Amino acid sequence: PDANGYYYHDTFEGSVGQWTARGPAEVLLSGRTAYKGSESLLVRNRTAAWNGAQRALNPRTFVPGNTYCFSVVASFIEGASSTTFCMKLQYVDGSGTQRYDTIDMKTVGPNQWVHLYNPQYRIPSDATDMYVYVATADDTINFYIDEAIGAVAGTVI
Ligand SMILES: [Ca+2]
């Protein structure tokens, strides 16, 4: 928990951190557009809306039943006239069933960064094998994320 209450903070300025592809997509650093610095994380090769970018959450830091802050900014340049970005928690519940709970969602047009943000998100008490992820609702556009943050509940960004 750094000086600003962040547990992780991905600027994507030289490193993808713990971010990986969700589904058969691919993620990589890109200098084509950025929210801060000169880079962001590009997400491409998606073949279904559920494909995207994900990051495993360590249960020792993000304790189920506890409340935390999550933040990311996203944008796209082409492929659609608008999209709906979703930041979500993928997890396995107490019955062994994989669940998808929405943290934040925002609709936006091309060439505009949008702030996916929830300073008061409660992780379900029974969650295991957790991942925070970003995808869209119903398209397969390439998209970019930047400034990916996991923080203490109440953290203003
Ligand atoms: Ca950046």
From Swiss-Prot:
Q: What's this protein's name?
A: Endo-1,4-beta-xylanase Y
Species per Swiss-Prot/TrEMBL record: Acetivibrio thermocellus (Hungateiclostridium thermocellum)
| Family label | Belongs to the glycosyl hydrolase 10 (cellulase F) family.
Look up the coiled coil feature and give its residue ranges. Answer: none
Boundaries of every CBM-cenC domain copy = 4-153
Q: Which domain of life is it from?
A: Bacteria
